[PDB]
Write a protein that binds this ligand. Sequence first.
Ligand SMILES: Nc1ncnc2c1ncn2[C@@H]1O[C@H](COP(=O)(O)OP(=O)(O)OP(O)(O)=S)[C@@H](O)[C@H]1O
Ligand SMILES: Nc1ncnc2c1ncn2[C@@H]1O[C@H](COP(=O)(O)OP(=O)(O)OP(O)(O)=S)[C@@H](O)[C@H]1O
Ligand SMILES: Nc1ncnc2c1ncn2[C@@H]1O[C@H](COP(=O)(O)OP(=O)(O)OP(O)(O)=S)[C@@H](O)[C@H]1O
Ligand SMILES: Nc1ncnc2c1ncn2[C@@H]1O[C@H](COP(=O)(O)OP(=O)(O)OP(O)(O)=S)[C@@H](O)[C@H]1O
Lengths: 189, 579, 390
Amino acid sequence: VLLFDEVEKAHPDVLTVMLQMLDDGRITSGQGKTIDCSNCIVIMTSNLGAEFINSQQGSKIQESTKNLVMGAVRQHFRPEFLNRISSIVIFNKLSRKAIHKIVDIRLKEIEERFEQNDKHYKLNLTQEAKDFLAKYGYSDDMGARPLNRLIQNEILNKLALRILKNEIKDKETVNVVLEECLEVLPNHE
Amino acid sequence: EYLSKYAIDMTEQARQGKLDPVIGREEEIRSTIRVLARRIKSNPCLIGEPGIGKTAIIEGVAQRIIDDDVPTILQGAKLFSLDLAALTAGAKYKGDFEERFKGVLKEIEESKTLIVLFIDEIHMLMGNGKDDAANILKPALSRGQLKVIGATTNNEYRSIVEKDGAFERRFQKIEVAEPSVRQTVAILRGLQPKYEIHHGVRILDSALVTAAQLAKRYLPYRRLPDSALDLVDISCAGVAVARDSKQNVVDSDTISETAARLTGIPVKKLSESENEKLIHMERDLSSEVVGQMDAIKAVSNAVRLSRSGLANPRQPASFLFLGLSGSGKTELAKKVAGFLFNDEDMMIRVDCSELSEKYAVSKLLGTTAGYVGYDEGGFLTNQLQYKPYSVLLFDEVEKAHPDVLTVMLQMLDDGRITSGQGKTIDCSNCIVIMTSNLGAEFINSQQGSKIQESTKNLVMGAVRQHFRPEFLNRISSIVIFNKLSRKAIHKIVDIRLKEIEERFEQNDKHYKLNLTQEAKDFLAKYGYSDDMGARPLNRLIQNEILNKLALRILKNEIKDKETVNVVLEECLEVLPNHE
Amino acid sequence: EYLSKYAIDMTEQARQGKLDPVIGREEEIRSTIRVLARRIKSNPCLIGEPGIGKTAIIEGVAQRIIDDDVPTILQGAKLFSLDLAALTAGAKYKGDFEERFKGVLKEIEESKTLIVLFIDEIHMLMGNGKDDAANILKPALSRGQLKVIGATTNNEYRSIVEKDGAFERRFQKIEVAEPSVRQTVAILRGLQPKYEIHHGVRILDSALVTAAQLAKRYLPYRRLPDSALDLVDISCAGVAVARDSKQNVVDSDTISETAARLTGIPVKKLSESENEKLIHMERDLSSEVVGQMDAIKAVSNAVRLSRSGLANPRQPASFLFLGLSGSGKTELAKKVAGFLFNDEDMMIRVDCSELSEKYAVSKLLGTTAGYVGYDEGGFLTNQLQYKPYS
Ligand SMILES: Nc1ncnc2c1ncn2[C@@H]1O[C@H](COP(=O)(O)OP(=O)(O)OP(O)(O)=S)[C@@H](O)[C@H]1O
Ligand SMILES: Nc1ncnc2c1ncn2[C@@H]1O[C@H](COP(=O)(O)OP(=O)(O)OP(O)(O)=S)[C@@H](O)[C@H]1O
Ligand SMILES: Nc1ncnc2c1ncn2[C@@H]1O[C@H](COP(=O)(O)OP(=O)(O)OP(O)(O)=S)[C@@H](O)[C@H]1O
Ligand SMILES: Nc1ncnc2c1ncn2[C@@H]1O[C@H](COP(=O)(O)OP(=O)(O)OP(O)(O)=S)[C@@H](O)[C@H]1O
C-alpha cells in the first residue's frame, strides 16, 4: 500500500509523475528502469474539503456539500490527475454518535499499546467516563483528534504521575465530578 | 581440493555444532529448498535488509541437511561457503584467479555428491565491467549445475541485477522477512543458551521480551534480529564486564539501562530514586522561571509520560507556546533542555525567521539526490539521528513560510520525518517546542495577568487564522502564557539577579545589594513592561547596574559585595580599593 | 605476519609506556570494552568530530590492556593500528592490496591470542562500489572474532553507512564528545607535563583553566581537547621562545596575547591601561560627535560591559541608532570601531535598501542546499568567519 500524505501540498510536478504511477503503473526510475506499481493499492490524502465539511451539512456528507468539496479538488488539482483516481471519497464527519464508539476504541488501544501490558484499566463509570469523554472530546471540526488528546490530558497525564509515586499497579479507575480524574491503589505498586 | 582452500565447509561447521540455530523461518527455508530442488537454475538467493537473518537462514538449511530434514537431493549435500579469497588472493599472473575459480567450480560439479555453494555477499561478483566476475558461474548455472545459494542487500541486489540482467536470470530471489516482535522474542529465546554459555550469565524471559520490545521502538535503524540481540548480547557483556571490573542474571532493567547507554533514551534508565525530580520537576522549573505554571505543567506532563512509558510511542511531545515577548516562552524551553540533560545547549534550535518557502525546507531536511550540496538536513536530519531524545525548538513558527509549517506536520505526527536523501528519522522520542507571538494581540488586552477566557480564545483566534488546523491539531497542548504580574516581576528580578551573580567566573564579581526589596522594586517599576515582559529587566540591570559596575571595575571603585541606592534613577554605591 | 608490516602495535607501545595519560574517558573505554566482550558483534566505533579523544581512547584501552584492567576476554589481547599502506602498498597488479587485507585478517583470526584492530579512519576503506573495494572485504568475517574498534566523524560515518547499509548493522557506535570545560582542564592537566618537558617551560594551572574556558568561549570551530590543547601548545611555544630568548605559560598574558594574535576580539586581550581605556574613548568620539554625548555614552557603556566580562556571552551588544537624518550616526559606528580595534574600517556592513523578501535572507546568510550560488554566508557570515568580532 502506498500512502501519500497531503497530496494537495505536493508540488504539481510530483503529481504529474504520480499520474503515470496511478494509471498504467509504469513508474520508472531515475536510472531508466521500469518498476510497475500495478499490484499496489494507492491511497492519497488531502484536506481541501474541510472548508465545506465544517458547514455541518450532514454527518454523511450531503449532496451539494460534496460538490463544494469536488469543486475544491477540481480547482486545486489538474483533471488529468483527478480522472486517473479509481475513486475520490469524501469522509463523513465524526458525529457524537461516532465519538461514543471511538472512545471505546481508543481506550482499548491505549491499553493494547502499552509496553507494560499489565497496567490496564477498569475505568469504572462505563457510562459516565464514556459520556465525559464523548462530550468533552467532541470538537467536531477537529475530528477525533481532540479525543485522543482529551484522554491524554485527563487520564494518562495523571496516571503517569501516580505511577512515579507508585500509586498504581493495574485496574486503574476513573471518577468524575460536577471534571474527570483518577483514583489510586492504596497498595502502592 | 580447492574447496579446502577457498571455501568453508558450512556443513561441517553445522556438524560440529558451531553454528547458531535457526528459529522458525520455515517459509524462507522451504523456499530455498524448493529452489534447490529445481531441475534447472536451482540457485536461490536471499534478498532483504542487512541484519534480518539471511545468512543465518542459510546456516539454518545447513542444519536441516545435517539432520536429513530435507529432500533426498539435499540429504546427500555438502554445503560450502565461497571465500572472497578465490579472487582476493590476487590476480598477479593474469587469469590466476580466473583459473582458481574455474578450478573450484570444476571440483564442485565433478561427481562428489551434491555440492552446494553458498556465496555470501553475492554482489561481490558483479565485476568491474563484468570480466573480474568473469561470468565463470554464468554458463555453469545456466545448465543447472553448481547449485548456488546467494545472499545480499535489497539495494545491493538492485546494483547487481540492474547492471547485469543475467543475475536476475541466474537466481531466484527469495525475500527474507524481518521477524515480528513476537517472532523476535522466540528467536532470542532460541539463541539464549548460546549467550548464557558464552557469557556465563543467566537470562530471564522478561529480558528476552524486553530486548525485542525496546529494539523495535528505540533502534529504528537496525532490524529486529540484530537489534534485539545487540541488546541481549551487550547486556550480557555488561554483566561479564562488571564482574571482571572488581548477580549474573540478566533482566529487564539490565537491558533497559544498557539500551539507554546505547540509544540515549533516558526513560530506560529507570532510575526510580530520581522520581523526586520527575515528580517535582514543576517546582524545579518554577525556580528558574516565574509563574507560567500552565506551561510548566504542560511540559512536565510530557516528561512524566515519557518516563512512565505511557507516552504514545509514535507521537513526540508537542507544544505551541503563545504570548508576549519577554513572557518566558524561549526561556522555558531552555530550562526544559536544562532539566532533562543538565544542559541548556542540548537544544536543537531552528530559527524560523530564516525560512523561505522557496528554499528553506532544505535547511531542515536537505535536498534530494542531484541538487548541489548534500550532508543534508543540518538542522534536523543530522541532529536527530544522533540525539533522538533531545529537545527541538522552533522559534517563531508563525513566521515560517507555509511549506515549512507543512514539514512540521511529520514531526508532530508519527515522527517519521523523512530526509532529502530518501531516509527517515523517526523522532518519536523527541520533545518539540514551538513558539509564537500571535497572541501578543490579545494577551496585551491586559485582561488579568493570568489570561482569562474570551481573551484566551481570541489568542486561539489568531492562531486559527494563521496556522492551518492541520498543524494545530498536532499540538499536544497549545499553551498561552500569562502576562507577568508585578509580583512575578519581583520574583523574576530576584532569580535573574541570582543567575547573573552565578554566571560570574570570578568570585569578586557579586552584590549584597542592600535595598533588599527596594532595589528589586526599582527594577520592577522601571522594567515591568506589559508588552516586553521581563526582557527589559535584563536590559535595565545591564544598563543601570552592570554598566555602573563596569565603570566601577574600570575605575577600581568596586571590589566585591556591591550595594545599590536610588536617585529621585537607580545607582550603585562605592566599595573601593579598601578591599 | 603481514600485520607487522602495516600496523602499529599499540600494545607494545603501551607496554613501553611512551603514551599520554588518558583522562575522563574511562566510560568510553568501558563501553568499548563491553562491546569487545560481546559474543558476536564485537565491533565498537569511536564516533564524533575530530579532536575529541578518539585515538586517546585507544591509547587508554591499550594501557588498560597492559595492566589487565579489562574482562577475561581481553586479558592477554593485543591491539594494532592499521589502515595506511594496507590499501596502497598494492599500487600495481590487480588484487594485490586485497591479498594483504585478507592475509592480515588471516593472521589475526588464527591462534595468536585475541588480536584487536584499530581502524583510525574507517571511511577510508568506505566500500568504493563494494565489488571487493576494500571495506567490502571485511563483512564476511565480522562475526569471526577479528574484533575491531573503528573510528570516524559523524559526517564520515553517515556517508559510509548511508552508502553501505551493512556496517551500521555490524558496528556499535559509541558517542565520543568533547569534555566539559572542567573536564577539559583535567585533560590539559594530564598532558601538562608533556608540553612542559618538550618546551622546557611551566604551565600555570590557571593557564590550563583559561585555555579550557577560552576555547569554549573563543574557538567554535574546534573541539575542546584540541582547541584548548592548541591554546596550551601554541602558548608553550611562545613561552619557549621567551625562555630561549632570556618561564611559564601565563594564564592572563601568554594565553590572551596568543588568542589576540590568532583571532583578535578586543575583549580577549583587555588592555591594562584602565586610567584611559574605556574612558578616553568618549572624548575621542566627542570630537567626531559634537553635542551627541548621549550616543557616545550608550556605546561606551556596552563596550565597558564586554571588557572584563560583565556582558552576557550569548548577547552581542547592540544598538539601534535612531534620529535626525544626517546626524552622523554612521560615522559614529566607524569611530567606535576606531577605538575598539584601532581600526575604523574593521566593520562589515549591509545596504539594507537592497533587501527583499524574495532573496534578502540568502543575500545576508547565503543560499541553502541545492540552490545556485554557494557564496555561503552571503553578505555576513561570509565575513564573520574571518572577523567574528567586527
Ligand atoms: N534464527 C535466527 N534468525 C534471525 N537471526 C539470527 C538467528 N540466529 C542468529 N541470528 C543472528 O542474526 C544476525 C543477522 O546477521 P546475519 O544473518 O549473519 O547477517 P545477515 O542478517 O545476512 O545480514 P548480512 O547480510 O550478513 S549484514 C546474525 O548476527 C545472527 O547471529
Ligand atoms: N517568567 C519568567 N521567569 C524568569 N525569567 C523570565 C521569565 N520570562 C522572561 N524571562 C526572561 O526573558 C528572557 C528570555 O525571555 P523569552 O520571553 O523566552 O524571550 P522570547 O520573548 O521567548 O524571545 P522570543 O521567544 O523569540 S519573543 C530570559 O533572559 C529570562 O530571564
Ligand atoms: N588523553 C589524551 N591522550 C592522548 N592525546 C590526547 C589526550 N587528550 C587530548 N589529546 C590530544 O588529541 C590528539 C589525539 O586525540 P584525538 O582528539 O583523537 O585526535 P584525533 O581526532 O583522534 O586524531 P585524528 O587522527 O585527526 S581522529 C593528541 O595528539 C592530543 O593532542
Ligand atoms: N552627532 C554626531 N555623531 C557622529 N558624527 C557626527 C555627529 N555630528 C556631526 N558628525 C559629523 O558628520 C559626518 C558623518 O556623517 P554620516 O554619518 O555620513 O551621515 P549620516 O547621518 O550617518 O547618514 P545616515 O546615517 O545614512 S542618515 C562626520 O563628518 C562626523 O564628524
